[PDB]
Amino acid sequence: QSPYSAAMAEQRHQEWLRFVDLLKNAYQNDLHLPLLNLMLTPDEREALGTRVRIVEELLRGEMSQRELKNELGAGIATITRGSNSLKAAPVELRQWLEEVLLKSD
Amino acid sequence: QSPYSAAMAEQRHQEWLRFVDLLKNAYQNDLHLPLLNLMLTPDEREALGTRVRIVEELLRGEMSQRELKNELGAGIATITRGSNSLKAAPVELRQWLEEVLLKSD
DNA sequence: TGTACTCGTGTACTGGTACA
DNA sequence: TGTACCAGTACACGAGTACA
Numbered sequence: 723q724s725p726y727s728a729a730m731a732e733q734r735h736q737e738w739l740r741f742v743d744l745l746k747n748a749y750q751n752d753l754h755l756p757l758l759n760l761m762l763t764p765d766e767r768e769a770l771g772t773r774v775r776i777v778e779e780l781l782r783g784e785m786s787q788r789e790l791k792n793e794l795g796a797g798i799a800t801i802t803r804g805s806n807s808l809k810a811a812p813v814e815l816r817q818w819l820e821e822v823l824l825k826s827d
Numbered sequence: 828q829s830p831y832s833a834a835m836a837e838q839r840h841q842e843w844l845r846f847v848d849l850l851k852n853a854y855q856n857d858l859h860l861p862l863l864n865l866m867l868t869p870d871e872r873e874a875l876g877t878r879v880r881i882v883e884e885l886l887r888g889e890m891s892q893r894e895l896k897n898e899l900g901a902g903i904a905t906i907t908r909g910s911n912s913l914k915a916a917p918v919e920l921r922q923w924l925e926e927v928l929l930k931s932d
Numbered sequence: 933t934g935t936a937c938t939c940g941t942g943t944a945c946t947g948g949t950a951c952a
Numbered sequence: 953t954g955t956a957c958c959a960g961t962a963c964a965c966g967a968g969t970a971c972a
């Protein structure tokens with residue numbers, strides 16, 4: 723059993739909250755897409771316009787191969803793979819994610 | 828019926844904005860990490876750490892130089908891509924980065 | 933027969949060398 | 953001079969296959 727610097731949410735590999743404070747401080751206005759450029763490949767317009775499009779239906783249909791995740795977008799894998807959402811675990815904090823969507827509780 | 832996209836239309840690409848306003852709100856704590864991974868790019872948790880960290884230090888003066896780009900974590904193709912990064916932004920969006928470094932604020 | 937999951941490839945990442 | 957291509961890593965984006 724090794725010791726741990728307090729509990730809180732960030733620990734072991736935090737190095738991210740210092741990232742959000744500046745990443746969103748720009749989000750307030752149109753300064754959310756100026757970060758998807760200074761990094762060259764951040765042209766994730768498809769990795770964002772198509773990936774968000776996967777939960778968009780995963781939280782409603784979640785049937786995979788039936789709407790248009792890839793026939794004209796991109797998700798077939800990024801929409802059916804969502805079944806593995808455990809990777810970024812939604813339920814852990816989906817509680818707030820649903821708060822801004824449904825969180826019917 | 829129609830998405831009405833003739834003039835302006837909603838907040839322009841609501842797909843990215845809906846993911847920005849929801850981010851900042853949860854970006855305050857760890858409610859954004861579930862989304863940054865289960866709805867953005869999760870293995871990118873390292874990519875963002877290294878994609879901005881290069882621009883972060885780029886404005887400072889390091890993380891790129893036949894040895895900083897590497898010691899940084901993967902800035903070589905990145906540090907160099909950082910130049911191409913201007914591609915997703917004609918020095919305008921990069922201007923927000925300066926807003927928190929030299930532009931003014 | 934249908935559908936789900938897993939897999940493929942290109943390249944995110946990571947970093948080295950050569951060229952511009 | 954540093955990076956862009958290129959090499960490596962392992963994954964992402966994207967594809968296909970297998971089972972039910």
Ligand SMILES: N[C@@H](Cc1c[nH]c2ccccc12)C(=O)O
Nearest residue numbers: 761762763764878881905908909
């Ligand atoms: N996540 C960034 C990673 C990146 C690629 N090349 C870069 C150059 C500089 C900074 C970041 C990057 C992106 O989407 O591209």
Ligand SMILES: N[C@@H](Cc1c[nH]c2ccccc12)C(=O)O
Nearest residue numbers: 773799800801803804867868869
């Ligand atoms: N970058 C995320 C995007 C993604 C791929 N497949 C998904 C399935 C569901 C939700 C998101 C995704 C990932 O690699 O996982």
